[PDB]
Amino acid sequence: ARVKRGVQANRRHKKILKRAKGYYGARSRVYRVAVQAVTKAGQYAYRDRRNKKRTFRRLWIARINAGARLNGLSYSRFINGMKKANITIDRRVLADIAMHDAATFGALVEKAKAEL
């Protein structure tokens, strides 16, 4: 019962080369190089699923700091004032309000500043 490897080997290599579409040079063309580039891409993507949650909180905090300093407060006093006022609005939503609704963010700063 002799088994030829041609058809399965072909479809196996085509899966990897398909995942390597758009890569430079040998990285999208030749299997020995494509298979390393796909594995490294998956490794980076796994690490960056974690890191993106850090990067976006970084961004929200920056925008909230700018919004609060426009209203006369720093981030570390504004967040303390929210926690003292029992306001549960998350940083994602607070940054959205600071960016797209300046009067509402002014009202939130007023509440935090009255709490201090």
Q: Nearest approach, Cβ of 92 to RNA (angstroms)? A: 12
Phi/psi at 41 (nearest 5 deg)?
Answer: -65, -40
Q: Nearest approach, Cβ of 62 to RNA (angstroms)? A: 11
Binding site for RNA (CB under 7 A): 1-2, 4-6, 9-10, 13, 21-27, 29-33, 36-37, 39-41, 44-45, 47-49, 51-52, 55
Quote the CA–CA distance of 2 and 24 in Å, as a whole number.
38
Nearer to RNA, 47 or 84 (CB): 47
Nearer to RNA, 47 or 83 (CB): 47
Quote the CA–CA distance of 24 and 34 in Å, as a whole number.
10
- Reported as type and span, the H/E element at residue 107 is helix 102-114
Nearer to RNA, 26 or 116 (CB): 26
Both tokens of 54, joined, read 């850090």
Q: Nearest approach, Cβ of 111 to RNA (angstroms)? A: 29
Nearer to RNA, 5 or 86 (CB): 5
Cα-to-chain-centroid distance, residue 114? 34
Enter the DSSP assignment of 28: G
Q: Nearest approach, Cβ of 110 to RNA (angstroms)? A: 30
